[PDB]
Symmetry: C3
Amino acid sequence: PLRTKAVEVLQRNSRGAFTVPAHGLYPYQWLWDSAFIALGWTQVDWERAWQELLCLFDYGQGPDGMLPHIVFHEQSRDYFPGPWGREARAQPATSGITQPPVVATVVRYLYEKDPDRDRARERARYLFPKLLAFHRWLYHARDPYRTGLVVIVHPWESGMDNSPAWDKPLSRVPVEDYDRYLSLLYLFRRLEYDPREIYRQSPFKVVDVGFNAILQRANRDLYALAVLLQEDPYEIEEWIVRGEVGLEALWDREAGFYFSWDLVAGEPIAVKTSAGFLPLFAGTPHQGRASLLAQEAERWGEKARYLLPSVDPTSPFFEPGRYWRGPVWINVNWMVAEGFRDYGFAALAARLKADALALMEREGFREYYDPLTGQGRGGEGFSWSAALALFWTR
Amino acid sequence: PLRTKAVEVLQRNSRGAFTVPAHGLYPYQWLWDSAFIALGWTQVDWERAWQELLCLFDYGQGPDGMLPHIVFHEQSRDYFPGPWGREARAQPATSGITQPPVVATVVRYLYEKDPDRDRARERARYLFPKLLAFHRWLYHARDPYRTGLVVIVHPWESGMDNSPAWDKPLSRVPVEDYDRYLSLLYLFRRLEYDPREIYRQSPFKVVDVGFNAILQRANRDLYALAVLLQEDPYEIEEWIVRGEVGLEALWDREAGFYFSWDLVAGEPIAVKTSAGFLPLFAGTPHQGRASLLAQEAERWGEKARYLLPSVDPTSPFFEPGRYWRGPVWINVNWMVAEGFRDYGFAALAARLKADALALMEREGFREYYDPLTGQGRGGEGFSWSAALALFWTR
Amino acid sequence: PLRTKAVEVLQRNSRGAFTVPAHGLYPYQWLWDSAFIALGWTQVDWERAWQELLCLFDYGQGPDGMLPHIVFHEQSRDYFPGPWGREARAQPATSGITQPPVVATVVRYLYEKDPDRDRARERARYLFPKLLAFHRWLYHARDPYRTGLVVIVHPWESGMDNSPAWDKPLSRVPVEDYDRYLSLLYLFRRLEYDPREIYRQSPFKVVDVGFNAILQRANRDLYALAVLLQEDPYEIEEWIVRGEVGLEALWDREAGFYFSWDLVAGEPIAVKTSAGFLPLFAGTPHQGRASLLAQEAERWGEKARYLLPSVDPTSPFFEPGRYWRGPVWINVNWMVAEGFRDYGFAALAARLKADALALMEREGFREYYDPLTGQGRGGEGFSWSAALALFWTR
Ligand SMILES: OC[C@H]1O[C@H](O)[C@H](O)[C@@H](O)[C@@H]1O
Ligand SMILES: OC[C@H]1O[C@H](O)[C@H](O)[C@@H](O)[C@@H]1O
Ligand SMILES: OC[C@H]1O[C@H](O)[C@H](O)[C@@H](O)[C@@H]1O
Ligand SMILES: [Cl-]
């Protein structure tokens, strides 16, 4: 059954203190995957859940606070030995781009719910300044004008690599898509990874509604952690107040949806994707706006057997089997269901959960699912699917 | 039919680059009229739509950023010749008071929807600092204590000249109404139009819920324009955060409505007018509050054939034919319908539109309408009625 | 009948310019009682209503702005003689702890509704800086890190002395409950009432959702008073913006309720009390969240004859007759009904009122009521019950 088999997936993908995202992969750790995965481990071993994230920060984070989307461990890792600072160690290679910052929301959960309160305090106090340094890096590097919104400089940073929202922005990248993904990374290295220059010169510069909604939720949860731990919340309050203005600005009244914005073109990207629901998870809309989203989600359910497709099924870009261009994803079902529940849309949240769980019962733990047939696609033994099966049924 | 005849009205009232508010009038340009009118021109000629507003700013705006409610052109105007700065030109007389600042909301629309993206960028980048200087003037002159709310010092500044809300405040103006309107203007000139002295000494000093709701919506839209154009949003964020506190303060829980405030008396003005619905257009209430407004609007619909009367039909001040003391206005129907739609009140928004359109089909394009009989009143070939007929049916 | 008998209670408990909370008590004045009581006096004598609060501030408030929960008058007081500063007078003993700051909300009501506008202005201008100094003391003493949330250092400060929420926090206080209440006060005196040391060292340190919701409502109302009186709102705006973030942080999504937080343990206190409804009175939730509260209140109504019990009737701590551990309280019914009404929950607000009024018709004016039988309990001729009977039926 679901939970036992989900544990088996997590154990098979474990490399000591981190979990690979899927069967077959090299021993590398991914940023947002590890955050969702840690939620899974809470249903198995609380220390192991904490260790997932200690490992991400301990081996991943730079002196400027940046958290990379991949840590290239190339080996298994032991648990954090504690204050670490008194022996020499190896620092692995990492990527030079980031991913959606759901981590603070996870750490708040682990802190609040760990039945071992001494451990909870020790781990949260250790992680708190590291989280704070990561949010700080995001704002300082990616919102240097203090707009309240951060930019992504590479489509991979959205976590939604080939979202049809990125098609037009990607098309302007001078050197079919892989060539443009690689050209961006070549530009960043050519610019010595200088945040000021790359923000100035990147030919891809997008305010991603997903990344921002996730960051705003995380800001709220980081604030709560700061108050509970009696840490100073000064910087976090600023991000919250600006971010509330920023995220709501992305609502397009004529479309009745939230859009990502293309700052190179200076235009909203008029493509409705599952990311546009994520401000519900941030908690920024008013109820009328949430109700218009609920109506939209139900309309998508008129054309797809399983919610929530990654793009509007009536979009000319909708393709039922192609990664972020139509298929259902377990992590996004979970965030969006959480958001709908928060706004009182209990039946719609329940449907999102029931569809996620049915897909995993039928097909096992896969990366994404065809919304028309329910066919499992992509990676096998896909860790965040397994982890969220465990968490959602706790 | 409606749209062709609406175009004819706009063309007949055109004076090159600006549009007079109605048939028969001198070649003068009005501030809020021109903003609504520009929306109309989008259905005819996008450049002409932009030119309406370029003309308002180019001939209207002072070195301190102030936009006057009237620019006394006394002649037709040519399109903006571009960087203008290298030849001498004439600067017309203007009024010394302002009007509701809906302009930034219009400019955002023109920017986002112009099919010519090069033109959109050129025009919006040109107008952005001018808009910003106007909002700045409003706050610095009319909210010197940084409350988040601006005062009007003359009833005309509300755009709702004889609203029954102004009766008591107007009655204290030392020298029947025209005498008091003129005395205010004499005071302002006597004080050399010094904003600091006039704020201190004006015997008429009102926080108008309409003006403020319109300004708050415009602040939100100016923020979006700043982010899209990669302009610095620093000042605008301050106005938004303070303005959200300010506008919501105007809600009176016992009345279940938003009231303008009389700062000379230090009291809410307990008169329910159509302006009290406008915080929906600003997007500040929560849904419960929006629902109480929807209930009120429906209650007004029990006594008036056509929504939305400018005053509660059960008010002792309600008069079905007298300007802002009862009659229906197309611009306010439009803003309020927009607001209700945003809060999910689709049927009520639809009714507001259907009533506005029926009145214009039956009576043509008039300034205001009797809510009991539907009789057209006031100006003929009334431009914002024609313009919003075009915009609302786009 | 209710109103005449309520007046009789207030008159019998009057000691000149202040009202004792109940029949039989020494001539002492209580902070939150006097605020609710002043609302009662508006239905009898407006000057007497103002005098209640003038007396509280004039004899109660320190040079640092602190308002104590008890002023130990030991005698009756004459009305405020006006600018007071030119003769010597007696300054009574006061307690060294505070109570929920509902006062600014009351003063706003008295200001707006006094039919004597000259008196209203004189009294409100006199009280405004004193209110402002009290809110300032609260934030500076009890939120020295500028979180937006204040702590209580003694359970009595919540006004909900034996709320089951305080059980675990109280249990850590080194020296059955009275011994721990007294030990806290001994600590404070040992620390010379130094706010910095007591915040640092108190073994009881709780973010009370009730106190904070009441303070946030009061901040909003103090802002409105500042704007109406043309006072400077600078400090108040800061408290409002931070407080909106703080109060919403207390929502627990898994429980669907607002919890107080224990800052010594660093944990939410997972006990659902009537205080958790009070953010409705502050106006901070969105409607979805208000709807989840309405659902919870209705669920409590499935097990209790009378709403609103002070603790969830299904709580293991629920006891129908024991002070704040189950019984119905008139003041909390009133605040929560006010809040529900604001969010459009008209039937639920009406039920709260109908239950409060039925209990007082049947049992007279008592401190609290058994939610299962309706039996009156605690003090007799309980002033805030009488006062809110008068106010709620005005
Ligand atoms: O599984 C690791 C990564 O694989 C793919 O790139 C997914 O689109 C991305 O969201 C995920 O984080
Ligand atoms: O048409 C120009 C002006 O005419 C009247 O004064 C209207 O009340 C005002 O709103 C409008 O802007
Ligand atoms: O009546 C005076 C006081 O008595 C009790 O301590 C109540 O619990 C408290 O809320 C009240 O303020
Ligand atoms: Cl809401």
